[PDB]
Amino acid sequence: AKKAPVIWVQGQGCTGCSVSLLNAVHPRIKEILLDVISLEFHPTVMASEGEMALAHMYEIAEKFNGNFFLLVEGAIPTAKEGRYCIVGETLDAKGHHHEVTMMELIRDLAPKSLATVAVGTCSAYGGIPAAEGNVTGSKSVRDFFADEKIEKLLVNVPGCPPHPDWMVGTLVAAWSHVLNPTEHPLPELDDDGRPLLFFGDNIHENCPYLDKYDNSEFAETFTKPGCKAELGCKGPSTYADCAKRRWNNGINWCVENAVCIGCVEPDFPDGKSPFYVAE
Amino acid sequence: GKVKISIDPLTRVEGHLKIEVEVKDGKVVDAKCSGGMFRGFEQILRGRDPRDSSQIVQRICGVCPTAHCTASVMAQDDAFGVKVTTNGRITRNLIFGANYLQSHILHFYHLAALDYVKGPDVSPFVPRYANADLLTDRIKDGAKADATNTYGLNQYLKALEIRRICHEMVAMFGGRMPHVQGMVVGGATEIPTADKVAEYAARFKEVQKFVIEEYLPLIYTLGSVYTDLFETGIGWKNVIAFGVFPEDDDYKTFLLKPGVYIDGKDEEFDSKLVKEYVGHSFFDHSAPGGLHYSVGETNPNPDKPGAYSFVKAPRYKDKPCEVGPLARMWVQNPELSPVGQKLLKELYGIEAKNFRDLGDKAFSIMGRHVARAEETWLTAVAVEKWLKQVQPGAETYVKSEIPDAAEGTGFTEAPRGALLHYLKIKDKKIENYQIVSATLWNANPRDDMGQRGPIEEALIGVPVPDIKNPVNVGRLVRSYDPXLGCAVH
Ligand code: SF4
Ligand code: SF4
Ligand code: SF4
Ligand code: FCO
Ligand SMILES: [Ca+2]
Ligand SMILES: [Ca+2]
Ligand SMILES: [Ca+2]
Ligand SMILES: [Ca+2]
Ligand code: NI
Numbered sequence A: 001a002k003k004a005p006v007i008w009v010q011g012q013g014c015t016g017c018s019v020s021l022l023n024a025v026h027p028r029i030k031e032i033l034l035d036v037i038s039l040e041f042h043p044t045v046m047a048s049e050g051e052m053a054l055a056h057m058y059e060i061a062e063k064f065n066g067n068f069f070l071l072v073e074g075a076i077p078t079a080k081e082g083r084y085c086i087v088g089e090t091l092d093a094k095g096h097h098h099e100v101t102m103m104e105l106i107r108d109l110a111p112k113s114l115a116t117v118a119v120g121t122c123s124a125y126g127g128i129p130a131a132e133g134n135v136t137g138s139k140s141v142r143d144f145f146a147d148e149k150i151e152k153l154l155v156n157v158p159g160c161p162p163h164p165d166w167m168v169g170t171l172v173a174a175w176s177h178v179l180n181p182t183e184h185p186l187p188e189l190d191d192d193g194r195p196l197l198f199f200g201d202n203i204h205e206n207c208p209y210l211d212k213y214d215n216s217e218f219a220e221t222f223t224k225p226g227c228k229a230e231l232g233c234k235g236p237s238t239y240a241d242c243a244k245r246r247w248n249n250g251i252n253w254c255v256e257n258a259v260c261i262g263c264v265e266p267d268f269p270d271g272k273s274p275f276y277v278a279e
Numbered sequence B: 001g002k003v004k005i006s007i008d009p010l011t012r013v014e015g016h017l018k019i020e021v022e023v024k025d026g027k028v029v030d031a032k033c034s035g036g037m038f039r040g041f042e043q044i045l046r047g048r049d050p051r052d053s054s055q056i057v058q059r060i061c062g063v064c065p066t067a068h069c070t071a072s073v074m075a076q077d078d079a080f081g082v083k084v085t086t087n088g089r090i091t092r093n094l095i096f097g098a099n100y101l102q103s104h105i106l107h108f109y110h111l112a113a114l115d116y117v118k119g120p121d122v123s124p125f126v127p128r129y130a131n132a133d134l135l136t137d138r139i140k141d142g143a144k145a146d147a148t149n150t151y152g153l154n155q156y157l158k159a160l161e162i163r164r165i166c167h168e169m170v171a172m173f174g175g176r177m178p179h180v181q182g183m184v185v186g187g188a189t190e191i192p193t194a195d196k197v198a199e200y201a202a203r204f205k206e207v208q209k210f211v212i213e214e215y216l217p218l219i220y221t222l223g224s225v226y227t228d229l230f231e232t233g234i235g236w237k238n239v240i241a242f243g244v245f246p247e248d249d250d251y252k253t254f255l256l257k258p259g260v261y262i263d264g265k266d267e268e269f270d271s272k273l274v275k276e277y278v279g280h281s282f283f284d285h286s287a288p289g290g291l292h293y294s295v296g297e298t299n300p301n302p303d304k305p306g307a308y309s310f311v312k313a314p315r316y317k318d319k320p321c322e323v324g325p326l327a328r329m330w331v332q333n334p335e336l337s338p339v340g341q342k343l344l345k346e347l348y349g350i351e352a353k354n355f356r357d358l359g360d361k362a363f364s365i366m367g368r369h370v371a372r373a374e375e376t377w378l379t380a381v382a383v384e385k386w387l388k389q390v391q392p393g394a395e396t397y398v399k400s401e402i403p404d405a406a407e408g409t410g411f412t413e414a415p416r417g418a419l420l421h422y423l424k425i426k427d428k429k430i431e432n433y434q435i436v437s438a439t440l441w442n443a444n445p446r447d448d449m450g451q452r453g454p455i456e457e458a459l460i461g462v463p464v465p466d467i468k469n470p471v472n473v474g475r476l477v478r479s480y481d482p483x484l485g486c487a488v489h
């Protein structure tokens, strides 16, 4: 009956995790919003703005204390006292304005949540904003929780972006657990806090090009037949179910089209780069 | 008698935006636009294999990643000295064109429409402003108000599926979406097959039907209710366009041509005259006077006295210029859709053949929405043509090698406006990479000479008769379809 309450916050994100969620099927996004979750706060799509939006967010976090999912898209920058990501402004009772940093927002909301779900490689692992060359002290949710000594149930759903099936599936599994924990145990997580349901399979082991790989039949260029290994494919070091699930309602996937770039992995992008050089 | 209104977060845009206005005598009299989130892609990119840039830059934005990918692979093509095949060019246009359709539809419905349409009484459609001046408030005939609101809301809901189908179209030759795999230096990674072209075409026809039969009629109907919104949100009336969707192999001709319109006069676009100022932005420049992007610098400084935004301030010949569908449609001046020609006559008593026939009405809140809808139709006509031109089986990829030392620039138009990526290579690695994006031109702060950015300037004069429900401020801002991820990167 009751929908899962969700507060969806964005740090150093690109909105791609949100856009990927909009691509959900079975259920589609209309049914997700009207039947599955109560999306209480989401900066990209919600009707209210500014003071009203923030007041609503905090009201839900209070009313549904210990009973909402905090969804985090994007990384948390810690340099310069958090000032590389300002998420809003709060107007106290005297008229004075105070900016809210991503650090402050997560420190505030995470202890109020039932669970935090880091969607996307940015929030889960740091991803591109935390890659070599950045000067923002960009940090993952898990590292920020560790630094802050915040003990809150945390599930990572990585990918850049994650497949909507991974995000929907994980959230539904979490909510089912809360509603009946002995009938619906929490999904088993790997050492990096991501569900084995979606991230247990190795791409390469499950790849339809594996026969070609075994016969040393490698594509000389993108538009030639063969395994993609010499073109830079990171399937061998990447764990996701893309080979089975494919992308955009089964239309295509990275390996058929081009190469896997290892987007779900905690070392994406630096440990998967250069993208067009073999592993 | 001035009152300050501060809106942070300004929601239903992409990314982190703050808007501050001062209101006096029922109108905005000053404004400040602030982007509050920085990642520094131009710093992150340094030292990498230049080919990685077309994957890394897409993560600037998950709404418009194909635009960044396009600009990046074109910069690489230029720097690497490789010429794309006819079929590669067309395939890249099909991948990118499908997302133009997705982005405009996403914008109008899922970002803009809740300033006009009353949604159901469940989150995230509520809470909302108490006096929101919606269709249900404006239209005095209650049955007509309900019918028109339901008409709009049903389109919003249907558009959720239409935009998803657009991403099936992007994935067809792009691999997945957001963040395609299918565009690379040298062309595109998957040759279209007859079956997959037909598959794209079948989906496209459904999208095209929605555009012509639902979207265009809703926009013109909406404008006929909010005629006051064609008369405000004006701004500088300066626009720039770089050219998008090359229609031949030498990139001399485009669907929408490059050009500049400043102070009532058309001129050619000269990339030498673009520069960025940082006087009110959180960045340090090594030299005064603004910097051309080919010597651009990304040295963030959140402590810079007097600065208020992570967005730099691009100027063309020292003039603020806006970008986007209004800019492109004004510069190209294409013929209007048959729907637009008909409904302008029927609903407004306006005789209009070409975009410029809208006159002053183009440079307004509703004018920006009209431009975007018309451009969606115009792009659909083009995609329909490209689907006939694409040749199953014809090579889409040409080999290349990373040069030791080179430079290249990719020019295009993202759905939100003019986009370039500048790439400098040294020792086979990225030495400098500079991005001048669409919303960067729109949502920038004041330059060193105090000239307001286009959104800031367009806010001046916007009516705010109800300070507690300042709905026209957000309506103006959202008419520009801002993306703050792109603006700041
Ligand atoms: S994980 Fe990737 S798609 Fe999601 S916010 Fe980060 S950059 Fe964007
Ligand atoms: S290297 Fe890539 S293409 Fe080749 S078999 Fe492994 S996952 Fe498949
Ligand atoms: S195939 Fe590789 S790059 Fe593509 S979505 Fe799956 S893990 Fe990410
Ligand atoms: N469209 C789009 Fe994104 C912005 N602004 C880019 O470039
Ligand atoms: Ca339902
Ligand atoms: Ca603590
Ligand atoms: Ca500050
Ligand atoms: Ca830049
Ligand atoms: Ni964008």
Ligand SMILES: [S]
Pocket: B063, B064, B065, B066, B067, B068, B096, B099, B100, B103, B414, B415
């Ligand atoms: S795009």
